[PDB]
């Protein structure tokens, strides 16, 4: 089951990091408000939930790890 997860984490990591940086910043999570139906307020909550180490920087492994906790409940 883990391969299907990773295929989605890549898809969704790419979607947030549309600029090709190699990580998701606190401002990629804001421009999602225009594409997804959530308040900016929720988006930063998401962000905050996902940055385990508090860099203010979302890495693929941090992104993939979060999605995997979710994918499996």
């Amino acid at each position: 089951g883990q391969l299907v997860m990773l295929r989605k984490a890549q898809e969704f990591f790419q979607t947030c990091d549309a600029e090709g940086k190699g990580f998701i910043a606190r401002k990629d999570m804001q421009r999602l408000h225009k594409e997804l139906p959530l308040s900016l307020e929720e988006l930063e909550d998401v962000f905050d939930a996902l940055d385990a180490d508090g860099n203010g920087y979302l890495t693929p492994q941090e992104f993939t790890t979060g999605f995997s906790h979710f994918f499996f409940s």
Binding site: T15, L36, P37, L38, E42, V46, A49, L50, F70
Partner: peptide, 13 residues
């Protein structure tokens, strides 16, 4: 944890 579900569930549509 629910706001992650929201955010992921939304990404899935």
């Amino acid at each position: 944890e629910g706001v992650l579900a929201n955010f992921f569930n939304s990404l899935l549509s």
